[PDB]
Amino acid sequence: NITEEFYQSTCSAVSKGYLSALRTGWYTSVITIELSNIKKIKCNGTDAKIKLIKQELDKYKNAVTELQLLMQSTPATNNSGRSLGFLLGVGSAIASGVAVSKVLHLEGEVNKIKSALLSTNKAVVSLSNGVSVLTSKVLDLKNYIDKQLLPIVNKQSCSIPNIETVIEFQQKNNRLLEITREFSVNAGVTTPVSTYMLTNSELLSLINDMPITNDQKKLMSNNVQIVRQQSYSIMSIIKEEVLAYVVQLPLYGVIDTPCWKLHTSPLCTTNTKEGSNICLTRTDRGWYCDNAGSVSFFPQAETCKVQSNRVFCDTMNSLTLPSEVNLCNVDIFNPKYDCKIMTSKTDVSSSVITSLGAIVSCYGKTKCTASNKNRGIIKTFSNGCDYVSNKGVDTVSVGNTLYYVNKQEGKSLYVKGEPIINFYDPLVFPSDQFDASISQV
Amino acid sequence: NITEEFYQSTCSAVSKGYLSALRTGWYTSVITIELSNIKKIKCNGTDAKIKLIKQELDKYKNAVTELQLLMQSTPATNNSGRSLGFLLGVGSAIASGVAVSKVLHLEGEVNKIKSALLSTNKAVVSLSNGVSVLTSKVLDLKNYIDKQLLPIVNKQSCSIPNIETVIEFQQKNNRLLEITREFSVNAGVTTP
Amino acid sequence: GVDTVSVGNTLYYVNKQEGKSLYVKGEPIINFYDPLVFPSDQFDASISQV
Amino acid sequence: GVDTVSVGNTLYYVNKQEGKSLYVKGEPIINFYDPLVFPSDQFDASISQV
Amino acid sequence: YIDKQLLPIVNKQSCSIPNIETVIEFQQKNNRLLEITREFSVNAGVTTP
Ligand SMILES: [Cl-]
Ligand SMILES: [Cl-]
Ligand SMILES: [Cl-]
Ligand SMILES: [Cl-]
């Protein structure tokens, strides 16, 4: 159950009650498509059905050629001031998948995988470097072409195939064309992993066969759409009648730990004289999750995805902070943690839509209200930082900007308190601390 | 007519003459596709045209199953120093649409919409919360499957369909597959 | 009359939209400040704050 | 010889690109500054500006 | 004709489904055999004209 508290003293709000799903590691599987090595199409027969097969077989060959050009390259990808995102480190997202992909280029490795998938479509292979991976065969075009399409290709006659075969081949070949299509506009690396790359059935099956915890299996299976978004597909090799690409799946080593979202907004004095005011803003906004005795902090919004009451985050875009970082919500002047803030003289009106309400920073001549769809305006905000819950409120207006509030169910608590900006003498207040803290000020 | 002035004193330039089109609010409509509830495909006939229909009908079922898994989740999305972007507030882009979506989960609301779109493909429905929305039916696979594909599915015979029907069904079903495709890689929320 | 502009190793194509430009001459305001007391560490500031 | 690096709760995989690294030893330059007069609010600065 | 055009659909469990034009063509070629047999069977093996 989601709850929320607004702190009038620091113009901020915390949303509690969430459960964690943090990607901590990676699992790499090798997906294969068995290809038919065919060059020639020996047939002088000008039959329309033969022509259609020839045309489809031509797309097949171009895809293979196109993929071979992609294989020649080494896979790579590249993954505000009121946020602490600049403090983050820089990881290499597909470094694990690429490491596996490089092994696949070694001679014998390809033939090793093909041997394992000879009788079955699912196997575990020991790679020459000494790493085991789940290998899977999702499509056998080699079988279909050699079994259904050989007499119309390998011979001058060329017994004209039925129309249903022409349709069927286009259906089966289509997946190869789409995979090639995605890789070719993404330089061999795609994310999220599409259903062309890995169908819902294949992914669910892969998850079940992943030797992970039953909780992780359940978690990933109920949130496949999120798993896809946190996954990469890496074109590896197309060699000796087999296309292979590495699918890099998220590993959730942290599950069901409490998470909370911190919302922040500018806190300024409200003197009538324009420009005689000083401002203060908490800069530690973002997602927080308890994690191994510390706290994983995610400054950027893109990093975390919320499903009902569970938060999916990526640890690569996080900081590991002392748990005392939470003290900034209760006592920003606490002696255990130096709470991060920024100062300014620019008192501009704005609103932050929270999980269960809205924070309004209203300054100057700005019209700031909250409304119900039926009644209309039910609250007019005064200058300063204020808050309203989503219960009974549908929209909030700050100036010419109308915000819809989240209609998530849950209780809000208004924690009254003197705005801390009132504690500072404007005559000696440093209003040029773009990245600062309580003690630094 | 566009004009422009450069101010040498402050190293800046202003381009005038433009007309506004500002998004100030949101309008939410409910788009519907009538689906045929089919499980079984009773037919032992190994005819190639039957096989193609079966395969296409299998994609249809997987799409439905895939969408049902997506429905289980609550929709959400996340929408330099020389710019003042850091001064901006933080809205919730799909808060209005999601609010409508939640109403649709309430029992009776679904049947209420289906009743309005019974005779027409365009109607306005009063939702139980007290909000009216334009509702639209853009595809009726329920009609097509039950009218063109029932004898080849509901019975052991299974009178083999013409090749043109096999083509036609793939054409109509394709849209459902693509919609499902977009939702599945976008966690149920797409834009544009 | 201009199609491109080059600054260092960077070539910019200009927009070929039709319309009149006006060059408003004026003393660069940076010349009004004494460098000895000029605060050059105001990342987010204003005229009065400087 | 290294495959991963862990900082706090964050596990980074390292690039397995082949190539030689050189560790150039040297006194951390932060040790050269007196903290009593060190400007720690220079968001965009330089050696001489500090 | 049978051994060249119709063997895979007869000699094997698969049975790669033949095109519709072959179905038509075989009926055309086979027809003559059926008619010859037809004439002989109502004429006790001797026909004239
Ligand atoms: Cl045919
Ligand atoms: Cl909105
Ligand atoms: Cl350019
Ligand atoms: Cl990593």
Residue numbers in the entry:
A (entry chain F): 27 to 105, 134 to 495
B (entry chain F): 27 to 105, 134 to 246
C (entry chain F), D (entry chain F): 446 to 495
E (entry chain F): 198 to 246
Recite the paper's sentences.
The RSV fusion glycoprotein (RSV F) is an attractive vaccine antigen, since it is the principal target of RSV neutralizing antibodies in human sera. RSV F fuses the viral and host cell membranes by irreversible protein refolding from the labile prefusion conformation to the stable postfusion conformation. Like other class I fusion proteins, the inactive precursor, RSV F0, requires cleavage during intracellular maturation by a furin-like protease. RSV F contains two furin sites, which leads to three polypeptides: F2, p27 and F1, with the latter containing a hydrophobic fusion peptide at its N terminus.
To characterize the prefusion RSV F protein, the double mutant SC variant with the optimized apex (N67I, S215P: SC-DM) and the triple mutant variant with the extra substitution that reduced repulsion in the RR2 domain (N67I, S215P and E487Q: SC-TM) were purified and analysed. Structures of SC-TM (N67I, S215P and E487Q) and the processed variant with the optimized apex PR-DM (N67I, S215P) were determined to 2.4 and 2.3 Å, respectively. In the SC-TM structure, electron density for parts of the flexible loop that connects F2 and F1 was observed within the central cavity of the trimer. As the C terminus of F2 entered the trimeric cavity, electron density became weaker, and linker residues QARGSG could not be accurately placed due to the disorder. After this gap, density became better ordered, allowing linker residues in the turn (SGRS) to be accurately placed. In particular, the side chain of the Arg136 residue at the tip of the loop was well ordered and occupied a pocket formed by residues from its own protomer, as well as the fusion peptide of an adjacent protomer. Overall, the conformation adopted by the turn allowed residues in the fusion peptide to remain in the same favourable conformations as those observed in the processed structure. The third stabilizing mutation, E487Q, which was only present in the SC construct, does not result in a substantial change in side chain conformation. However, conformational changes are observed for Phe488 and Asp489, with the side chain of the former adopting a different rotamer in the SC-TM structure. It is unclear as to whether this conformational change is due to the E487Q mutation or to the presence of the SC loop, which packs against the alternate Phe488 side chain.
